[PDB]
């Protein structure tokens, strides 16, 4: 009797949540990956300028 509607709506709304769950997860992954670079490059630049001011005395 086209009674599919019950489980149909069920699975529909299930996916309609799963999408947003996946999206907040990908967003948090995105930002934490940004944080990784942000903690990396600071130390990179620190050591670069350190050795730079140490070694400019030649050329």
């Amino acid at each position: 009797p086209e009674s599919i509607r019950k489980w149909r709506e069920e699975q529909r709304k299930r996916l309609q949540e799963l999408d947003a769950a996946s999206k907040v997860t990908e967003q948090e992954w995105r930002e934490k990956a940004k944080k990784d670079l942000e903690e990396w490059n600071q130390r990179q630049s620190e050591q670069v300028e350190k050795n730079k001011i140490n070694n400019r005395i030649a050329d």
Partner: protein, 117 residues
């Protein structure tokens, strides 16, 4: 006809009857893949959690296309990737991890299976 009994059920909303009649349909020793195909199909329809394990057993037997179709109907990508693997459908696994990583993402497995593109 077995599919036509399926229809003979869903016409009346006998989705529960579909369930029940599959409950002992597993008692077979002379049939072929299409039965299991439908099995996972009606899983996806109502009990999609169960086709995973069994699928991970009979997989060696069933066709490609109907499997692809029903797997899509599942929209369960964390599984669809494993399925592509079973059919070594690399490209599909790739695009799916692209669009559905946080469900289907597996890191080193992907980084090694990538070499077939």
């Amino acid at each position: 006809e077995l599919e036509e009994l399926i229809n003979y059920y869903q016409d009346r909303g006998y989705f529960e009857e579909l369930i029940t009649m599959l409950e002992a349909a597993l008692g077979l020793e002379r049939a072929h893949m299409g039965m299991f195909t439908e099995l996972a199909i009606l899983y996806s329809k109502f009990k999609p959690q169960k086709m995973r394990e069994h699928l991970e057993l009979f997989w060696s037997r069933v066709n490609i296309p109907k499997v692809l179709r029903a797997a899509e109907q599942a929209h369960l990508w964390a599984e669809l990737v494993f399925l592509y693997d079973k059919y070594e459908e690399y490209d599909n696994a790739i695009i799916t991890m692209m669009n559905h990583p946080t469900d289907a993402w597996k890191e080193g497995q992907f980084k090694d299976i990538i070499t077939k593109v």
